[PDB]
Write a protein that binds this ligand. Structure first.
Ligand SMILES: *[C@@H]1O[C@H](CO)[C@@H](O[C@@H]2O[C@H](CO)[C@@H](O[C@@H]3O[C@H](CO[C@H]4O[C@H](CO[C@H]5O[C@H](CO)[C@@H](O)[C@H](O)[C@@H]5O[C@H]5O[C@H](CO)[C@@H](O)[C@H](O)[C@@H]5O)[C@@H](O)[C@H](O[C@H]5O[C@H](CO)[C@@H](O)[C@H](O)[C@@H]5O[C@H]5O[C@H](CO)[C@@H](O)[C@H](O)[C@@H]5O)[C@@H]4O)[C@@H](O)[C@H](O[C@H]4O[C@H](CO)[C@@H](O)[C@H](O)[C@@H]4O[C@H]4O[C@H](CO)[C@@H](O)[C@H](O)[C@@H]4O[C@H]4O[C@H](CO)[C@@H](O)[C@H](O)[C@@H]4O)[C@@H]3O)[C@H](O)[C@H]2NC(C)=O)[C@H](O)[C@H]1NC(C)=O
Ligand SMILES: *[C@@H]1O[C@H](CO)[C@@H](O[C@@H]2O[C@H](CO)[C@@H](O[C@@H]3O[C@H](CO[C@H]4O[C@H](CO[C@H]5O[C@H](CO)[C@@H](O)[C@H](O)[C@@H]5O[C@H]5O[C@H](CO)[C@@H](O)[C@H](O)[C@@H]5O)[C@@H](O)[C@H](O[C@H]5O[C@H](CO)[C@@H](O)[C@H](O)[C@@H]5O[C@H]5O[C@H](CO)[C@@H](O)[C@H](O)[C@@H]5O)[C@@H]4O)[C@@H](O)[C@H](O[C@H]4O[C@H](CO)[C@@H](O)[C@H](O)[C@@H]4O[C@H]4O[C@H](CO)[C@@H](O)[C@H](O)[C@@H]4O[C@H]4O[C@H](CO)[C@@H](O)[C@H](O)[C@@H]4O)[C@@H]3O)[C@H](O)[C@H]2NC(C)=O)[C@H](O)[C@H]1NC(C)=O
Ligand SMILES: *[C@@H]1O[C@H](CO)[C@@H](O[C@@H]2O[C@H](CO)[C@@H](O[C@@H]3O[C@H](CO[C@H]4O[C@H](CO[C@H]5O[C@H](CO)[C@@H](O)[C@H](O)[C@@H]5O[C@H]5O[C@H](CO)[C@@H](O)[C@H](O)[C@@H]5O)[C@@H](O)[C@H](O[C@H]5O[C@H](CO)[C@@H](O)[C@H](O)[C@@H]5O[C@H]5O[C@H](CO)[C@@H](O)[C@H](O)[C@@H]5O)[C@@H]4O)[C@@H](O)[C@H](O[C@H]4O[C@H](CO)[C@@H](O)[C@H](O)[C@@H]4O[C@H]4O[C@H](CO)[C@@H](O)[C@H](O)[C@@H]4O[C@H]4O[C@H](CO)[C@@H](O)[C@H](O)[C@@H]4O)[C@@H]3O)[C@H](O)[C@H]2NC(C)=O)[C@H](O)[C@H]1NC(C)=O
Ligand SMILES: CCO/N=C/c1ccc(OCC[C@@H](C)CCN2CCN(c3ccnc(N)c3)C2=O)cc1
Ligand SMILES: CCO/N=C/c1ccc(OCC[C@@H](C)CCN2CCN(c3ccnc(N)c3)C2=O)cc1
Lengths: 245, 48, 97, 290, 245, 245, 290, 49
């Protein structure tokens, strides 16, 4: 009654029969902006079906020597579907997300992942190596899009913060002896109630193998990791022509 | 201290070396007092 | 709960992710020591990675019981039994199980 | 869930009466009475004798209105006594670079130490006051920073260190033209009382001669380090002393004990001079004279 | 009705028919730790018979030129019986004590003793004689055990405090014309409600002849002093393997 | 709801998530001696925490050609902990036991054990082989202690009684396809209500592989058997000095 | 007089139901039902299986009136079995002077011993019967005295001894023309049950090889010595045997245990033949045949 | 792997006693952890430089 689930929203459902449990980030569901909070005076659009779908984005192969990946949300979906068309026309934006990452393996493979969220995941550099040149990260390390980006130094998460206490932020583990998926429901976290969808990326989805993959030779050596996400309770405002960046 | 009580047994085809991740926190009767500055100082020179 | 690094042995930059987890393996014997660590969040050691042990770095004195959770990340069909023993103060590092 | 009667069956003698004044002396007369004797006590009981004035001599009615308020612990201890002195000289050996770490041990001067060693366990709040001046006595326009380093905080190692940023430590910035900086300090010990005497060792293990330095050192009493620097990157042009006075308030003291009669020699141990054991009083040539 | 007594606790009783009186140290009996005071969260063991016994420890001969002795409690009983086995297994400890010291003599002998308690009886040295070398006392002068230790300078009690005002602390006298024993019931005095039994010695039993022994030659020249003590209301906590020191 | 259990008593707990079920020997829990049954007139000691712990004793390796082992209780615990200190000081003794034997294996290993109790398990010899010399067993075959002892002829249990009807006495099986542990709660069985803990051994824990271990080569060849036991409702009486045997 | 809540808070699972007859078999029918299965048990629980007839096969209403009274302990043990034999021959080595001390150990013959070794602890009354005759079988006009020597009483050392005066011991004077002397014996042990098995030593101390003779010897079971002499100062002119039969009554037995399958070799120990361990049953050549 | 901190208490792991915990949690609030004046800026106004 906990191992088996089904998440239907929009026209797309996903079934899982070896889940762990759904955690709701910071204990509350995504919701619409109340009139106590809103400052924009134009009526928002709320598509309510066409953008609240599980978008399956990409597939990272996980071998025995991987480091970890990250996806900046919502810039994984400003190139995809009716979410990517409404977020490019409209200046303002708010939504929550239901984030579901699948990674199946046999009952002989082993290894654990820490799929975790963290809001305002800013990216530092190696500062020129020795630490004296103020190098800023490029635009693709900042906002990789639906392609994702691989961590260089996952012990410090490319930001000088340790991964050992990433477990404070909303997370759950995918260890291949127990579960194969990890649902994380995230509300809209930001100070101001709407923001731009092209500039500001509210959070980043860190997916790091902490305990590495291991399997005896003869088993299937290709163990993919696919993340599917669904913008919940999304609404846009401030209509103008299409910007792409 | 962590001791093997019986063994770690595997079939043929399973990896004979597994890894334990140690998580740690406090209970609900945990309190602290008399706030001070931390022992590591995260600065060597002038922060430019 | 927050990752306690019991395996605080490796130090080079290419293997700092080795610290977060410590190995078990098929021993050929009777009651071997897997890992041992100090059980105090103030002392320099394993507890400096957890947020229990770094918010306690701002407070001079703490109290209360505290929990340690061990997640086994092996395969499905690999079983075993481990003995996790907390020795109270005064009693030194134990020599056998 | 038992049938046994052993398990199912399995407190102070003295009452604190209020006594604002010393007790009155009621009128007594003579008594020529056998059987009862109020003079002949038994001192081998180990009780102080309960013989009063009236049953030894014919007394008059004296209404004693002499108050007993000066002798309470809050009136005996709430006097600021010198417990520390910090030197910041221009050139020398002892702290030549304008900082000084004085760890808080108030057993370094023998008038405040003599009173508070009357009791074994004391629980008190204190208000420290830091009277600072040049060694000739005069006040100079110099800015100082005092800061309190708890056990575990980084000790500042120089004048221009990073630990003087006082992000969480309490710190006091006073110049010497100001009145003395006075701050109040709570009861900070982990135990329920500062014990002036700890007959024991803090750590386990074998106790050899090399680590007899820990004897009498309780960690519940050592409460940190008091650090003071002249605020500036350059060296200050004034030699300084900082005298630390503390008075105790909200005092609770337990378990009295005999008061020191030999000279103090060191801090945090009762070591006394061996060949120079002097008697606790003065002396006279014969007992039958004065 | 005061000269004759009997103290039965545990399985061991002692009779005395020339006692003085029982004094209770600081006016209160030893008692268990209430839940207002306790901080340890494991359930204590309370043996209740096997450790509340009068342990007869040693026998000091008292001649005409003695100085005085002292015993550090509870380190006289961390080598003896089920008290010495429970105090070596368990980290924490609290107890009171019923302390009974016997010294009989004839009706022609004379002399008085001051058997007194004092809590936290720390031991100083002679500081190298002249008083300039910070010498710390050895471990055997600190904690002599059941063998006891003889005072070097009893006028200053080896601590720089005079014996003339030792009579503040709980005491009673053994003068050989009146009594032959001295019961002192001592509660548990310490700040923190439990402590270690191997490191911290709560109090010391000073037994000093103030008025010296005297007897004409022909009487019995061997006048022993035996102390018997009984831990009352003892309880232990924090079970681990046996430490001895 | 039967496969997963947890047995906490004292300060020590053991978790099991592939248990069979707890059987209570002869249908009743261990309990204290009522005043209808007791004959000793001194008040017993009841430590209640410090001796009611799961003592993990030893580890027998089980290979494909083993015979079987036995442990005489309570002489496995008269050398261990505060139970071994209270049982050596006190003449009388009674307790029950919670006996938990672990033996894990993979899902490819096979084999079954018969961990069984039997009270008053007296040991015979081979009578000089041909059966004419009255040989008595040595003290180490009689009372092996915490080291255990291996059966010579397990078909007759070294006592002339067949193992085929050992299943009368309180028992349960550890077959490695279903369970990995076997809890047996045993009350105090003896005629007289207290007895000596050094002479009389109330029962013996027979652990015999009936169906032998088997596994294809490549699997883990070291399959240990560790027994943990907990004296429940233990109480001692008759305090004297320490005897060891 | 406590404030703690730890001290103030500080039983059988089975009920003996009456069962005079074996239980009836109620009518069952077929069942085609998932979810519940009465056949598939778990024998690794260590419980005997509670699967009945009705949930395995279609049964009829059988009113079982078969009594279970023959299988009680008072009907299984109250049969007089041979537990002792005493020889009083005319001339020989074994008792040549007409007395014999037979200490009461009823584990000397393997039919009574085999039944009572099924249980560990047994508490019973017994009535002993002493059938005495010449070795050829015939009865002769000879007077005998049986007497019971408890532990501590003087053992008689000869026929014409002083201990045969039986001032306090119970004694039976029967001649062989009479019927067999039958006396009832109570439960005499200091413990609450005669234990047939005592895994332990009676005495403390070190246990060397010379005193392994005490292993398995409990003093609560050895209840004395049974002595028998031919009444007279002269020697009797008849060789004698005395067979002792005892049946147990008022029996309570505790803690069953496996029944012996190897031959008995000695008294008061379970020693068995080592090279001659025989299987507990018969055998066949193959398993797939009969 | 749920990603929840464990709700196992003291009482269901070890035999415990009644401890009335009166240890206050007021020092660890945000208004007591942050209301300390820390050095955040330094401004130099030298004579010549
Ligand atoms: C002029 O001149 C110049 C100079 O020379 C030249 O140049 C050249 O070029 C060429 C061409 O390109 C080249 O060659 C190439 O190479 C490549 C590479 O290699 C390298 O690298 C690798 C990598 O690694 C990785 O991975 C692994 C696993 O796999 C792991 O383990 C590791 O660790 C790593 O990891 C990493 O990375 C990753 C990525 O992804 C990530 O993720 C992570 O994180 C990490 O970081 C490596 O390994 C290598 O190494 C090597 O070396 C070393 C030394 O030191 C050693 O030790 C090792 O062992 C190795 O060796 C081996 O190997 C190799 C291979 O690799 C070989 O060759 C050798 O011999 C040996 O054996 C390196 O470093 C590669 O890849 C390639 O190969 C390919 O090709 C060939 C022909 O061509 C063949 O034969 C092979 O087989 C292969 O094939 C494959 O692949 C493909 C593509 O990919 C595919 O498609 C296919 O299908 C296949 O697959 C298959 O098979 C396999 C097996 O192998 C399996 O597994 C699978 O499943 C399937 O079935 C090539 O070779 C070169 O290099 C250059 N040079 C140099 C010097 O380098 C030029 O050219 C000229 N010009 C003209 C015009 O000519
Ligand atoms: C080589 O060379 C070297 C050099 O010389 C050598 O060395 C040597 O060695 C030796 C051997 O060891 C030695 O000898 C010895 O000695 C010893 C010691 O003496 C010393 O000391 C003492 C002590 O005192 C104490 O005590 C008292 C009482 O008693 C008191 O009074 C005092 O005060 C003191 O007290 C203190 O101490 C204590 C202890 O306990 C404490 O407690 C307290 O607190 C206090 O503090 C002393 O006294 C002495 O003195 C002396 O001297 C002086 C001078 O100045 C004088 O004045 C005096 O008077 C004295 O003298 C006398 O005495 C002596 C004895 O003592 C004599 O001898 C003389 O002659 C005179 O008379 C000193 O200082 C001792 O002890 C010893 O003796 C012993 O022995 C002998 C022989 O051997 C004999 O004869 C004797 O008798 C004795 O015996 C006894 O003892 C034992 C043991 O203990 C016993 O057991 C016995 O039994 C006996 O007892 C008895 O008797 C008695 C009488 O006497 C009686 O009383 C009882 O009761 C019983 O009956 C010895 O002598 C030496 O010394 C060394 N040297 C030098 C110089 O020193 C080497 O050896 C070499 N080598 C080789 C190889 O040879
Ligand atoms: C003078 O002279 C003299 C005369 O010679 C000499 O003497 C000598 O000495 C020596 C020394 O000591 C010796 O040698 C040695 O030996 C030993 C023993 O062997 C035997 O035994 C065995 C046993 O068995 C058992 O087990 C099994 C399993 O394992 C099973 O199956 C069976 O059944 C059994 O069981 C039983 O027992 C048990 C016990 O525990 C129980 O429990 C049960 O119940 C049962 O009862 C046996 O097996 C053997 O056998 C053999 O032989 C036969 C014939 O008949 C055959 O058939 C078989 O097969 C066998 O053979 C094989 O093996 C062997 C071995 O064993 C080899 O050697 C051969 O070659 C073949 O291959 C016998 O009888 C042993 O043990 C040893 O060995 C060792 O060492 C070596 C060198 O030194 C090496 O190389 C090896 O490898 C080994 O090593 C191992 O071990 C160790 C110890 O233990 C360890 O530590 C290590 O680590 C190792 O381990 C490893 O490896 C393995 C493989 O092997 C594996 O498995 C594992 O896992 C790991 O990895 C030695 O060799 C001898 O013996 C003697 N002699 C005679 C004749 O004997 C003297 O010395 C001189 N002097 C001078 C001065 O020099
Ligand atoms: C800007 C910030 O301004 N901060 C000022 C400031 C002032 C005082 C302060 O802490 C005062 C501690 C005293 C009240 C008690 C000192 N005590 C306790 C018992 N003890 C003992 C016991 C046994 N042996 C020895 N040797 C010594 C001892 O010395 C902290 C901070
Ligand atoms: C004129 C007077 O006539 N008197 C007759 C008469 C008859 C019988 C009698 O006492 C009968 C004692 C039996 C009822 C029980 C014998 N028992 C107890 C258990 N036991 C055991 C236990 C464990 N190992 C061994 N080897 C033996 C054993 O042998 C006393 C007096």
């Amino acid at each position: 009654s906990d191992r088996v689930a089904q998440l239907t929203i929009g026209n797309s459902t996903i079934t899982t029969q070896e889940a762990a449990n759904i955690i709701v980030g910071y204990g509350e569901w995504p919701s619409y902006c109340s009139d106590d909070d809103a400052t924009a005076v134009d009526k928002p659009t709320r598509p309510d079906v066409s953008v609240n779908r599980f978008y399956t984005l990409d597939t990272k192969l996980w071998e025995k020597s991987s480091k970890g990946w990250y996806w900046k949300f919502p810039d994984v979906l400003t190139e995809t579907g009716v979410f990517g068309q409404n977020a490019q026309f409209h200046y303002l934006y708010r939504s929550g997300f239901c984030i579901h990452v699948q990674c199946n393996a046999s009952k002989f493979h082993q290894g654990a992942l820490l799929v975790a969220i963290l809001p305002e995941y800013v990216i530092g550099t190696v500062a020129g190596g020795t630490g004296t040149e103020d190098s800023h990260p490029p635009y693709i390390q900042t906002q990789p899009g639906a392609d994702g980006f691989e961590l260089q130094h996952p012990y410090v998460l490319d930001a000088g913060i340790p991964i050992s206490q990433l477990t404070v932020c909303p997370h759950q583990w995918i260890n291949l002896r127990t579960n194969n998926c990890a649902t994380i429901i995230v509300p809209y976290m930001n100070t101001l109630p709407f923001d731009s969808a092209l500039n500001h990326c509210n959070f980043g989805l860190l997916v790091v193998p902490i305990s590495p993959l291991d399997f005896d030779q003869g088993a299937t050596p290709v163990i993919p990791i696919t993340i599917t996400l669904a913008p919940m309770c999304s609404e846009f405002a401030g209509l103008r022509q299409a910007v792409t960046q | 201290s962590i001791w093997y009580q019986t063994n770690y047994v595997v079939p043929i085809g399973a990896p004979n070396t597994a890894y334990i991740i140690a998580l740690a926190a406090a209970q609900k009767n945990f309190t602290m007092k008399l706030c001070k500055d931390t022992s590591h100082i995260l600065q060597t020179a002038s922060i430019q | 709960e927050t990752i306690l690094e019991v395996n605080n042995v490796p130090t080079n930059a290419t293997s700092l992710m080795e610290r977060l987890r410590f190995p078990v393996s098929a021993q050929a014997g009777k009651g071997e020591l897997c890992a041992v660590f100090r059980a105090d969040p103030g002392r320099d050691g394993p507890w400096q990675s957890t947020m229990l042990g770094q918010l306690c770095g701002y407070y001079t004195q703490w109290s209360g019981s505290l929990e340690v959770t061990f997640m086994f990340t092996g395969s499905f069909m690999a079983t075993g039994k481990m003995l996790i023993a907390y020795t109270p103060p005064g009693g030194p590092l134990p020599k056998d199980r | 869930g038992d049938r046994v009667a052993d398990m199912i069956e399995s407190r102070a003698l003295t009452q604190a009466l209020p006594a604002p004044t010393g007790q009155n002396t009621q009128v007594s007369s003579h008594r020529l009475d056998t059987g009862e004797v109020p003079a002949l006590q038994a001192a081998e009981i180990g009780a102080s004798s309960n013989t009063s004035d009236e049953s030894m001599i014919e007394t008059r009615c004296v209404l004693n209105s002499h108050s007993t308020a000066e002798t309470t612990l809050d009136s005996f201890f709430s006097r600021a006594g010198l417990v520390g002195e910090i030197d910041l000289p221009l050139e020398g050996t002892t702290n030549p670079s304008g900082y000084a770490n004085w760890d808080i041990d108030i057993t370094g001067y023998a008038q405040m130490r003599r009173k508070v060693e009357l009791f074994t366990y004391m629980r008190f709040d204190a208000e420290f006051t830091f009277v600072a001046c040049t060694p000739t006595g005069q006040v100079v326009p110099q800015l100082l920073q005092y800061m309190f380093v708890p056990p575990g905080a980084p000790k500042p190692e120089s004048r221009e260190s990073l630990a003087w940023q006082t992000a969480t430590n309490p710190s006091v910035f006073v110049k010497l033209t100001d009145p003395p900086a006075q701050v109040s300090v709570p009861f900070m010990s982990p135990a329920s009382a500062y014990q002036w005497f700890y007959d024991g060792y803090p750590t386990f293990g074998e106790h050899k001669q090399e680590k007899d330095l820990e004897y009498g050192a309780c960690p519940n009493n050592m409460m940190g380090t008091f650090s003071v620097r002249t605020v500036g990157s350059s060296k200050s042009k004034y030699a300084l002393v900082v005298r630390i006075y503390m008075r105790m308030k909200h005092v609770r003291a337990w378990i009295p004990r005999p008061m020191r009669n030999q000279n103090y020699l060191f801090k945090a141990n009762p070591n006394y001079a061996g060949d120079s054991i002097k008697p606790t009083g003065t002396s006279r040539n014969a007992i039958t004279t004065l």
